[PDB]
Subunit: 251 residues, 6 copies
């Protein structure tokens, strides 16, 4: 009756059918405390799980860890317990010169640079969000006063070569990814992160509602390693937006 990795039961969720799924286990309590009656449920591996209440309805907050594989486990196990809507929040690197640190991006579709999406649907299938979730995320971001961009997200199984970073141990990027950042830039792609392709393909092919919003922590036309100075303020804004987006999805 406890799910295998997350360590929670259906009763622990207290009726929740919506989950906010940040990446970092440390963001879980912060998100829960933006809501009412936050309650710690479990922590195992990269999965920290809280419940809280938003306009009187239970919401679960569960970290995913980095990457499609760990995200896919959390989504499956939460779905087993009745969760049907998944709101992903995370950090991201902008590809376009005009998208600045602190701006918010809402993904309209993901470039599938991952492996786990292929475990749910063949490559032809679109990694696209639920329209209601994407609409809620746009409205929450805009209502908050943020600068918001809607568009395509390149979603990579690596932080380093698949985002065409060269300041690395080998300084090498495999042929597939050489020139890839400028290719995505010329195609209008807004940003890089590491989970949206898996999450959106999995949910869109499995009857689950999902969307992604992310705060820009670096502009890749400038540099490869994000500055620490701006991380906390961008993170605070993103989680305020995602909780408001959850409020708009409650029925």
């Amino acid at each position: 009756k406890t799910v295998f990795h997350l360590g929670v039961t259906e009763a622990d969720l207290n009726g929740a059918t919506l989950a906010i799924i940040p990446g970092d286990p440390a963001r879980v309590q912060k998100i829960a405390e933006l809501m009412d009656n936050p309650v710690f449920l479990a922590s195992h591996r990269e999965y920290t799980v809280y419940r809280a209440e938003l306009d009187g309805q239970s919401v679960v907050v569960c970290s995913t860890g980095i990457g499609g594989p760990s995200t896919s486990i959390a989504v499956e196990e939460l779905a087993q317990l009745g969760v049907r809507t998944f709101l992903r929040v995370g950090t991201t690197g902008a590809i376009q010169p005009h998208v600045n640190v602190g701006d918010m991006i809402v993904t309209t579709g993901s470039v599938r640079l991952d492996g786990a999406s292929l475990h749910f649907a063949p490559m032809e299938f679109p990694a696209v969000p639920d329209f209601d979730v994407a609409t809620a995320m746009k409205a929450a971001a805009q209502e908050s006063g943020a600068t918001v961009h809607m568009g395509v997200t390149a979603s990579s199984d690596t932080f380093y070569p698949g985002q065409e970073r060269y300041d690395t141990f080998t300084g090498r990027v495999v042929r597939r990814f050489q020139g890839s950042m400028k290719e995505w830039q010329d195609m209008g792609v807004l940003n890089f992160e590491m989970e949206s392709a898996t999450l959106l393909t999995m949910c869109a092919s499995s009857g689950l509602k999902a969307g992604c919003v992310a705060g820009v922590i670096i502009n890749r036309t400038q540099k490869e390693i994000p500055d620490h100075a701006t991380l906390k303020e961008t993170e605070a804004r993103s989680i305020k937006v995602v909780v408001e987006a959850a409020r708009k999805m409650l029925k």
Copy 2:
């Protein structure tokens, strides 16, 4: 300059930056006449081109023919002549039992079962619409009184084997497509058509805004025959909806 296939010049379009692109040449005049001052511009091969005025702004109506290849020529040549927004309309058959004849579908992403999309972006890239166009299409469709479905469309380079039809000369479907209709049904795909993967991938990777709307006229899962009045109503409603969606994009 006159573009190679469409036979029109930039001056012929009178400043239009938006095009409505049906598949059937005979539907071009029917769409144009819902607007002010429709004028025939050209007809060559499958490309019949009219200009009209909507709220005082010039709009193009141009047929695409069947399939991504002929669609890709029309979109490119119109873009050479200043068009930046492309609204695809038609009627369609559904593959989900809950979708009824006369309902509308607004595509949120396409399964790329085509070839021409690969001439613009590798298969990983999402065949997704511009979010403003999809939003305007949803609103216009709802305001028509129709029941509207937002969701994924399977976009095939064939009418017969790629839609898993067996009632054919050979009665065979190649390995790739055996079992495919049930596969898409179980992944929540709403419908089949033959152009959206090429159109959406081309435009999303080229800085052009695109979307697709279709009224439903048949359903692979419901064996009954719809009434003539309903099919006539659905055709009329689809084109009223696309023109109202264009009005929302120009505003």
Copy 3:
């Protein structure tokens, strides 16, 4: 009894088992009038259909539109009505310096740069003409007095990026097609067009005889512009050649 797109019945074809399939609906009547007793049968979308008599035998002439998708519908529906041999006549761009405007090309195999051929056979399968049809087309083309080239044709789902054209709205070509025209030139490929890969693969995997012949309307390597008179003669010779090739196929 009436096929879904072409609008004709088996009886309308008066026993024809051979069709000549140009791309452009306006060339159908021209081809039919080179034969005896031409009869208009139907026009719907890009499909204009005539019948005529050649040495006392019925022959269908049916346009395909541009691209594999629209071609695949016409071939299927004609095969449902008893047609077994398909002769494709069409325009092409030569990419070899020794091939001049006005020469003929008879395709011995196609580079499958399309999507619809994969709806009939996996990529490993050769896009190959029927040997009797290719033999008949070579003989007809040579007997006309034309200079005739037998060889490989690159068959693309786009006119622009898949033929490595840069004079376009974006001026970009996706990675797959960058450098591709020089690649095909160095591999001895003669020309680009947009339907032979689908046609030849579909027919060679479905028990239908097919072949393709084309007059060269431009050479991608020559800066000189062809005479209006030269293009006119080339158009006329191409259709006289395909009718002669049809004569040689009748049994």
Copy 4:
């Protein structure tokens, strides 16, 4: 002097370590480190808990990877930036062959690349294989512990559920690519499923880094019996004793 972005440590923090033991679970990091001398906590950020210890007088890092190739690839790269050149993966696992019993140990000789991150280092043709010295040391350490040791191929999946052909799930569906896959791997002699070795081995073998994987079997997909609690606890303890003894063999 830089601190690497995800792990939050500097080169000086590692005290000269050129070998890392990389379990998946952050809670297992301290448990491995305490088998060595002078264990010290360095950092914990996200799924990455980092300790340093000393083995026969040499510095060794212990750093968790999280689940899956993506988070693993970050840890390996950032440790390599700080001088680490040898990576010893440890963990427990479930087998797909009837002759491999719970509590047995598997040393991977190559991985089926059912992941995505391996493709960010080398095209699919490239073999996901371990360094031969690491695999040799892992085999010897596993045998010296008294365990039954199997050398062979591991299927390394980006999912726990469909990519391991599990049907007891929310949708109950497995995509076409993975339908029949478990039987296919069983008939090809594959030993086990796990979720990180394809990425780890391909990344390292293509980047001048020495890597290997050793695991304890925590389930056998073909057996009805359920292992007892003592057996599972013994297998956990044995797997980390084994990887520390394999490290000792690599340092000498």
Copy 5:
């Protein structure tokens, strides 16, 4: 002045030959050469036995390829460095259509590329098709010999066993890719299986060389998997008479 790496012959050794007949079995080389005038042994190294001869006063090379695209690609390349521009393949084959009889001939109009070496010359989209004049010469030579000749598509496999969907093997298994493949090709109208035409035709058609393939049917897969030796000599004698007359038509 060069001696090619594998064939062990120089351009002077070929006495001006621009046409080669390329059987697979080295023992067939002398048999083909003796159907022509003034045959001379040139070299034998590995699976490559090379003779020259004269046909209608013109020099002709005969060189074995061995089995498979890789060894064929070496012989074709090295002969092309020494001036050969036309390559006539003769070999044996298994029919996959019930009406084709043992002893019939097949002239390939295009090959299903079930090989790997063709991809070393052109991507998979490129058609494995013969030169039209060679195919035409082979059809006419085959008809004129009295044989029953079929023109059509050939499935060209890198293996004799699983890629031809044979089950009478050590494991009895066929990998997923090839399960059902023989019936799939049969329903697509494919005539036969062999092992070199995909590589040869793709290499040549993408390299400015003229090539074609003719093969004698030694088995029909409607009946059995292992060919009978009974009529093998008869089929082989007819096949080589045909290929020499096809060469005569190409020189004319």
Copy 6:
């Protein structure tokens, strides 16, 4: 019992052998057999020359493969039908790393699958890896001989020319897939090129057969010096002494 179709031998002809040494060149078969006791010629057909000998009182087969995965796959299959379970490949190789000299030996720990026949046994994700016992025996035999021995990844190509990125050819062209590929493999630490290991190791690892590859370096693609005849002859002799000693270590 039956005579296998290509090799032309029966189970009784092998006198109980369950281990085969499989060189590439048919002329090397007798030389290997004569390093053992009581060598007996069994058959020669096409590229397949087959001998039997005795090693420490046990029957061993020696069978050539020809060049390439396709002809290798036939020999391994037919030997397996006759009871062979362990296959020791010896062959020549071109090194691509500057540190690997002519006369050194390479023992493959995994192959880059630049072939087609491996895909007839397992999908591309599957690793082309050796049996751990065979690789261990080859390393020991090679090191005990006094040779300098390298363990690592081998690029296994269906061509000698474009798939090894040679431009010194009739067209001077290398298809897009292989342009830049030698530097890519060099930077990924790949040791050498040959033409059979991917097929052999994938086939065997997915079919319950034990296989490994050892190779003598006959050229280095990064070196301008040409090796002298004496060095080449010594390398040839050492490679077959090594493979015989590795067989000795595999006998039970």
